[PDB]
Amino acid sequence: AADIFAKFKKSMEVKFTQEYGSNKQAGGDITGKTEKFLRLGPEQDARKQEMIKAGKEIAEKRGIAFYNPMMHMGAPLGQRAITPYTISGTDIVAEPDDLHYVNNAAMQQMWDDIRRTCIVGLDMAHETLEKRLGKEVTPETINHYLETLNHAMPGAAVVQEMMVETHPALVDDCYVKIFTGDDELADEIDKQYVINVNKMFSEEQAAQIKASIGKTTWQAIHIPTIVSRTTDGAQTSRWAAMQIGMSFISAYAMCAGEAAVADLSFAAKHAALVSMGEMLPARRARGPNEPGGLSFGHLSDIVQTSRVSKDPAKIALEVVGAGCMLYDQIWLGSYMSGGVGFTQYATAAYTDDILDNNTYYDVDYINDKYNGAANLGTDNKVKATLDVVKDIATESTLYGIETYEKFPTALEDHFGGSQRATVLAAASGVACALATGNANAGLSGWYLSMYVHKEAWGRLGFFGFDLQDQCGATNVLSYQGDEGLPDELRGPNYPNYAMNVGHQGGYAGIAQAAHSGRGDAFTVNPLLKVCFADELMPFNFAEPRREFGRGAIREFMPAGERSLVIPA
Amino acid sequence: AADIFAKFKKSMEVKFTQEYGSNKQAGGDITGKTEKFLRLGPEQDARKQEMIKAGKEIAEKRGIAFYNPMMHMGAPLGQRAITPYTISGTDIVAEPDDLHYVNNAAMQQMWDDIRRTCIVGLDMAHETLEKRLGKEVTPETINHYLETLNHAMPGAAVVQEMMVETHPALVDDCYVKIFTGDDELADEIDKQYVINVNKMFSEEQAAQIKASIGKTTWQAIHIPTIVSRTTDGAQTSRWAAMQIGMSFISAYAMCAGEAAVADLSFAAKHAALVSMGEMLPARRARGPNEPGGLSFGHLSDIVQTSRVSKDPAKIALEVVGAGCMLYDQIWLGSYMSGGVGFTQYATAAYTDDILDNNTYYDVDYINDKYNGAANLGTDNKVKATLDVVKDIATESTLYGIETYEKFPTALEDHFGGSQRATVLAAASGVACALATGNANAGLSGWYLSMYVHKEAWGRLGFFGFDLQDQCGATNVLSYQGDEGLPDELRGPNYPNYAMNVGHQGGYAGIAQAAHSGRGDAFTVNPLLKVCFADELMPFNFAEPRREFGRGAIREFMPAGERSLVIPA
Amino acid sequence: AYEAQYYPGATSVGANRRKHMSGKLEKLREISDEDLTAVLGHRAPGSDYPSTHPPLAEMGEPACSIREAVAATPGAAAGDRVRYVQFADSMYNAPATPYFRSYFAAINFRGVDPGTLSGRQIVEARERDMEQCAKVQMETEMTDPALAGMRGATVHGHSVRLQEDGVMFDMLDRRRLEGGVIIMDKDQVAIPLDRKVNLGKPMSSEEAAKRTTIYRVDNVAFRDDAEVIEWVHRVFDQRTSYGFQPK
Amino acid sequence: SDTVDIYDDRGKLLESNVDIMSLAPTRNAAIKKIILDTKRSVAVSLAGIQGALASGKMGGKGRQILGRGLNYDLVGNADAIAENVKNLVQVDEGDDTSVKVIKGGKSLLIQAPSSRIAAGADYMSATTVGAAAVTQTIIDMFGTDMYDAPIAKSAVWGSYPQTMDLMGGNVQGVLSIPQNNEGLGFSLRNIMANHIAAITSRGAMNAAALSSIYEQSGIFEMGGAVGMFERHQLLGLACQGLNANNVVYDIVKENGKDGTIGTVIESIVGRAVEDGVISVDKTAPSGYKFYKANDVPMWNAYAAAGTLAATFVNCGAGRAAQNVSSTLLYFNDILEKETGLPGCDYGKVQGVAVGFSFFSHSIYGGGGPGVFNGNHVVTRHSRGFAIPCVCAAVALDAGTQMFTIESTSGLIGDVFGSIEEFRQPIKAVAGA
Amino acid sequence: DMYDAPIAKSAVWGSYPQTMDLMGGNVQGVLSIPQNNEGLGFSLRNIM
Ligand code: F43
Ligand code: F43
Ligand SMILES: C[C@@H](OP(=O)(O)O)[C@H](NC(=O)CCCCCCS)C(=O)O
């Protein structure tokens, strides 16, 4: 697309040909092959200057050494110009350091919003009440329950005398809404508690969700961020169940602790629970609701772009961005390692419009070659074959490589081979998935991209990068026990994927792409799709990339801060 | 002890005979058996009033129901007077609600300080350098290494060009110190980095510690609270290792990534790592450095009272307090459940001096009857027998029960049977451990207390309280595979202990008591003892109960807030 | 035939505990079927028992030698819901203590699900079986209507100082002294009734002291009951020793 | 070297003068066979795979992959499937592989040959080879193109290997995955009570017996039956699980009409006195008699027997599973009060029952009795003497539960309930 | 002595069952504990 290409060139112009801080990069040509290295060091960058000053001040105050760029071997950072990033699809121009998750409240809040969320069916609980107690469940009793629940969930008492409670000002982000595939029920629940499927989704998307879940009713529970940050992911479903239990006791005048209550527990904690992700094996031991457990389809469903956009590529790209940030910066870059971590490995996939350029080129290529296959639809899709993948993936990768070659700015932007590989393979995979409506065909294209990349440049990514790459093509359509899996159900714990940056976000985009090409309401789980179709949540799941930008410019307010109970 | 008994009386006077908020509880007798119930509801209490107002305003602003005490069945909280708690051993009078961990930054920070900490040996890494690279390690090279590490550990670059870094002002709580049993080496390391064993401990304790660890050198690593809160405990050792690795590369001019580097990784991540706790099984799946994995011995060693006190009872009581808070309020009451949780289950063991009264009585009884056995010493201890335990535990429990009976205020304070059970058994167990220097004799005493309690009152604790109780006596000296274990090595994952409030903190106290009676330098791990012998840590580990008080009155400053990068 | 001895101890607390366990209890008051149903709050007084499953005779039963040997209760036969009665008892010499209520149920009633807590004790059973159990507890010396209360939720009070009129605190005020008698005008989960249930006069402090199954140092001191302490010590020594080596 | 007579669930003598050491999981051919058969067997829901294939609903709760429908008539072709599956599962023609079509083609029993178990570290080969065989059969029989292979595969395997288990899959045995073990040697303890009652067709004594076999095999594997502990555990297994000397059944019978937990205690104590297992040690001033055991392991076995008989009586009376948690607690609590002797497992049955009561009547976890097992955090603590009672209780429920045997265990019941050594475990152990 | 039984036991078994394994104990084979398995049928693959 000409418009995306123009945006890409503008991003290169801004990054490399207008001065940032005092980097002296005013003027020049985004196609030129040369650069003047001024050896300014870190001070050329406004953020680094602030950091240096804080570091020295804190060191002196606390009495033990701290941040000191002169501790870098040989020379301090910024012997070449330190340049900004534009958040893709936006005019937000960010300090590099402001995109580190530690430094970015929007990124932290995105994870918190996922971590602190679970989904619990209501039907089993209602059946328990009817069967064991002979209670009648009506819209009225549900409304009373939901009001009770909205008091109880943030951490407040409904039954016992002399209870202490969480401070409401600390847990303001906690609430429960319900959603239902039963249109009649939906109309009779107090609107304050309802995620209205018919209002939030197109008529065709609503119809798919309703057909998938039938006439079932579900709670979308978001526990306090402050709690989530004190504890862990595995807390979430436990917290939800406790307060669901108390709310049932209170709202339905049960015995405050009888046999029927245990059925409610079991339902809430197991039989009718939907977690964001499942537990992880011993080497990387973690309970549910951690990033490792979050399947690529689950992430695709959390992200809300599919709901508000008719552009298949855009939907996929938002998922890529959200995925690269979560999976690489927070998951791999912190949970699974730490330190400086992997900001730029991820930013490559959501900044400067480079990925978008490659992807939009592909959409045009596909539409020209395959009779409008990349357009939203189900009849227009092409059957996944090796031939189709070879065609689309090769062409995508050649085009991406050539762009890096014609624009030394782009190559210097994506200075790591890994970054370029993620970008090239993400566009290839997304393109193959868009064309075929087959997520694994997307995976094939991803892997093929890597193979083309490697032969073209005589290099690929970092030392370890292509473990999953080389196992990649062969495991796409394997049906062996620990090899076979649709990409929609794959995730960070899929064996080949368990370790390495620059992939997991791409695979999420590929999962989404197979479905957004088709205009599907969801990628793998309608329950998650509806759960997050809720503007009350702190993080805007419909525009993840933009949200990262808002965080970079310190305009995002997270939940969970403790200033109320802190010295001023 | 007369001073403790008097201090208990004063706590009962403050709580029940002096007005608090608007509760009208001026005047009266602490021994009287009657009360006038004014049915004032929550508004009588100043915190509740503030919570009510915040709840109403937030509900209105966000457009979904929230905190509302009128949702409590029958009647709102405070049909009887809402009365305060005094932190035991202090004059800090706290609002009940201010001791909920969510509402209390000191409690959150105590957990943060532990979660974010690990200990990594240096000897193995030094051998690696010498063997594989033929490097000489000297005090000078270590000093340079530690300066590098204190730059890198918070999340700063030492090797690559064009790196983004954590903002120093967000991660000012992160640092690395060393300690060593090699006195000569200690004298040669820059003092800014050293935990000085000879300065921080008494001569006797320093000698025990040095004899234990020999001439080994260790890094005490505390990663950023902000990171710990974003991720989990399993992050900690990974983060430590990453930055240790980078620092070795930089400080010793290694290849930035060679085979020898992997040896450093294995040593930091595994061979020379000491975690606060180990991983947990599937049902309660969690990685290392979570509360469940934290042995009672470990907690005893983190708490620093043993280092600054020579009163065995005081030392044990501090551990009880720290333990009930962490294990019951955060771990069992949040991680393993959630909601309103278990504040008062825990406060019962660190407020109003009730536990202290019983314990100090026990010390006097023991000293009188067992020739000063409870005084600090090793050869004054009595050999653990059934007779000794029956004597001490029975006496302890009888006295504690009589106190509750003679002071209706105390009974009403510890209104829950479980609370009373923890109190009585803690005293009994600590008492038995103090006399014998045998932690499992402490456990026998704990269980017998429960047995006496149940028969005396025809009640014990909550429905599920005495699962471990009834398994308790028989498993104390079992040597069966999944039964036998010294209390020092027991923890929240010991099978009988894995579920229920009101025990774990007591067991920590009992483990400490066996050692504090002896004047021992540590309970199970000298590495943890020295690691936390460090005033730079936000949480004052020498005085956990007081610290909780400081948090209650909003005087504790936590790490990890994000106000720097948040809208103002 | 083996005759149960129930519990050790020669004090009044001993005699009372043995009375509670054996069900050898003095009837002190009456409650009509309809009044009892009312306070229990599970169905309209006088109404049919709702069911959770069809009667045994209607649906049939799997081939089972135990089902064949063990007679279903009337409540089990009819497929009644499992419902409950729950009580709080003051530590200030209420006749009942939680464990002893549970022992009474387990010893004297078929098909019961007793649960003991500090602040409450419950019996869950098939509705009609449960009622017979609630009736006994309510009409006998086991319950004092001032020092105890039937409470299905918000049970707080057992450990709280008494009101000046000798009534144990109820957050939800389900029962209180009116005209020298205890009136219960709400169900056990504090839903107001269309009736005032007369539970008769409370015990004097003196009488409750003589009738209580609880020990207290200002009444019958546990410290002084060498026989029951011996019981505890014996069980303790056995459990400890046998957990090391069962021999 | 104790000898016992073994009696069936109707009080009929099965075998006289059995040495208890011959009842050891490590010695008894029939128990070994039960264990081997349990390890090597899995159920497959052909109906489930067929549904997942057509709808895309695979991989876990809520999951659906749109636009990837495969319409394969598995149920209509179950015999041919079973035959192909047998060919893949077997190691050698004529080995002990068995594959049976269950419930009109909806389900399969797959018994992997014992060679796979011999060659394996554990039992998961039955699942993995079973799933692999079914996956291969489907792909071959229905002509799945390679671009659809992932969809066919996950219809069988669910979310594995993103998940550690076959979450939202259609292959499962009676055991769970090894990684769910809380302890070492716990795999045979990780069997839902509902499963046990399903497999024994709600025969309460048979449920308790099958459960005792697994539990004690568990204890043995945990190293909890070494030296003096062997006699201890086998006495319990015999007296509680295998109706030794008809005592359990006899006690039930005499307490069946009007008996309570209270009267069952009287039955046990009466016998213990008669049989010389216990005697009065001391009479207290009040006339209360303090007992001592003449044989501690034997007393424990009487308490174990009593605990079960009490379960049969109390749960039996109420036709209500929930009564089991209080039965275990109060049988043992009141027994100690009655005698001054320790209750079953020296407090550990009572211990389990305290937590089990709470976790079967509260907000915090657990559930109805049917969800518990010997590997469950709540009910693991006793050495095999609690969970058999729970399986009995679940068997006896006449329909109070939300989590019925069918809801959790229908497939397992249909498939494993057909196997006679499982359905009739007392007869199996007694060689009848 | 039974009061020292816990010490003798853990000299052998280490921190089990606080830990999932015999951490700091003195009994080991070639294999690892089952729960260390990444996948199904992996125990025999878990040999250093
Ligand atoms: C020491 C290693 C070996 C290793 O295991 N990890 C390193 C270490 C470094 C450390 C660097 C922090 C620091 O500078 O102190 C961290 C940040 C991980 C951490 N500990 O936080 C890291 N790499 Ni690496 N590392 C990166 C990259 C790279 C690229 C850089 C090539 C180039 O031309 O600059 C190459 C791999 C390759 O050749 O493809 C690379 C190498 C290597 N990577 C070499 C150092 C290379 C050198 O001597 O300069 N990283 C990248 O390719 C992109 C971004 C990136 C990182 C963080 C971010 O995403 O912002 C990151 C992240
Ligand atoms: C619904 C239950 C059943 C269950 O499984 N847990 C409950 C639930 C309640 C809820 C109460 C919140 C609310 O009121 O909405 C919570 C806070 C757990 C949560 N969901 O966060 C809880 N108990 Ni409980 N719960 C407690 C206690 C108790 C004591 C109270 C007896 C009394 O006389 O008041 C008794 C058990 C006993 O008798 O021993 C008890 C019962 C029971 N406990 C009864 C309610 C009893 C009633 O109807 O009043 N709790 C305590 O003994 C002390 C403190 C305490 C809790 C929190 C804190 O520690 O601050 C707590 C904590
Ligand atoms: C029993 C078990 O729950 P499940 O039976 O697995 O649902 C377990 N919970 C607990 O043990 C809760 C402990 C804290 C709350 C009660 C303390 S008295 C857990 O969540 O893993």
Residue numbers in the entry:
A (entry chain B), B (entry chain A): 1002 to 1569
C (entry chain E): 3002 to 3248
D (entry chain C): 2002 to 2433
E (entry chain D): 2146 to 2193
What's the paper's own text on this?
Methyl-coenzyme M reductase (MCR), the key catalyst in the anoxic production and consumption of methane, contains an unusual 2-methylglutamine residue within its active site. MCR is a highly unusual enzyme, catalyzing the reversible conversion of methyl-coenzyme M (2-methylthioethanesulfonate, methyl-CoM) and coenzyme B (N-7 mercaptoheptanoylthreoninephosphate, CoB) to methane and the heterodisulfide of CoB and CoM (CoM-S-S-CoB). Structural characterization of MCR from Methanothermobacter marburgensis showed the enzyme to be an intertwined hexamer with two copies each of three subunits (α2/β2/γ2), and five post-translationally modified amino acids near the active site on the α subunit: 1-N-methylhistidine, 5-methylarginine, S-methylcysteine, 2-methylglutamine, and thioglycine. In vitro data show that a B12-dependent radical SAM (rSAM) enzyme, designated MgmA, is responsible for this post-translational modification (PTM).
To assess whether Gln420 methylation alters the structure of MCR, we aerobically purified the Ni(II) form of affinity-tagged MaMCR from a strain expressing MmMgmA, allowing determination of structure at 2.0 Å resolution. The protein fold seen in the structure is nearly identical to that of the unmodified enzyme with a mean RMSD of 0.25 Å. Clear electron density is seen for α-methylation on Gln420, consistent with the studies described above. Surprisingly, the active site contains the CoM-S-S-CoB heterodisulfide positioned near the Ni(II)-F430, whereas free CoM and CoB was observed in each of the eight prior MaMCR structures we have obtained. The Ni(II) is coordinated by four nitrogen atoms of the tetrapyrrole of F430, the side chain oxygen of Gln161, and the sulfonate oxygen of the heterodisulfide. Nevertheless, it is important to note that the hydrogen-bonding network, including the water molecule in question, remains intact in our Gln-modified MaMCR structure. Thus, the additional methyl group is insufficient to displace water when Thr423 is present. Second, the Gln modification in MaMCR, which also contains the Thr423-dependent hydrogen bonding network, alters the binding of the CoM-S-S-CoB heterodisulfide in way that allows this reaction product to remain bound during enzyme purification, as opposed to the free cofactors seen in each of the eight previous MaMCR structures that we have obtained. This suggests that product release has been altered by the modification. Structural characterization of the Ni(II) form of Gln-methylated M. acetivorans MCR revealed no significant differences in the protein fold between the modified and unmodified enzyme; however, the purified enzyme contained the heterodisulfide reaction product, as opposed to the free cofactors found in eight prior M. acetivorans MCR structures, suggesting that substrate/product binding is altered in the modified enzyme.
